[PDB]
Amino acid sequence: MDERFNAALHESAHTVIAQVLGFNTATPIIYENSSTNPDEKHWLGKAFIDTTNGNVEDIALVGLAGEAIQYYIEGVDVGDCPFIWECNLEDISLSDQELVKDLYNDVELWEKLYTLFEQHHDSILDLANSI
C-alpha cells in the first residue's frame, strides 16, 4: 500500500494539474501489476487527460506533474529538479517523456508547478485518497 499510495499520488498530480490548466479529465485508476519481472513497478496507474488542443508548455506541466509531486514532497529545490528528472529518466514513463520532451530543463515551469502544488496539494491528496 506504501507503493500503491505513491502510484495514486502520481496519477492524482497529473490529473489535478491538468484540471487547473483547463484540460478535460476523467478520474484516474490504480491497479496491480501481475508481472514477475523485478525491473517493473508493482503498482500501475492510468490517467485520462485531453492534451490534444493545449499549448506545449501546459502539456509539459501535466507531463512533469507525476514525478514532480514526489520532488515537491521530498523538498527538492526547483532549480535542482531538472537534474533530478534527468537522473531518473530510466524510471520515468515514455508517455510522460512524450508530454515533457526537453522542457524539464525549464526552471520557470518547475517554479510554476511548485506554485500549483502549493495551491492545490489538498485537491491532489483528496483525489489520491479516492482511487
Q: Using the rule CB under 6 A, which residue among 70, 93, 97, 105 binds ligand TTN?
A: 93
Q: Choose the one of ligand TTN, Cl ion, none that binds residue 93, judging by a C-beta under 5 to 8 angstroms depending on kind.
A: ligand TTN
Q: Contact with ligand TTN (CB under 6 A): which of 95, 115, 119, 129?
A: 95
The secondary structure of residue 39, as a DSSP letter, is T
81 or 99: CB nearest ligand TTN: 99
**Strand partners for 48:** 26
Q: How far apart are CA 35 and CA 40, in angstroms?
A: 7
Query: CA-to-CA distance for 128 and 112, rounded, in angstroms?
Result: 21
From the list Cl ion, ligand TTN, none, which binds 130 (C-beta under 5 to 8 Å, kind-based)? none
Residue 101's nearest CA partner among 73, 51, 67, 59 is: 59
Contact footprint for ligand TTN (CB under 6 A) = 46-47, 93, 95-96
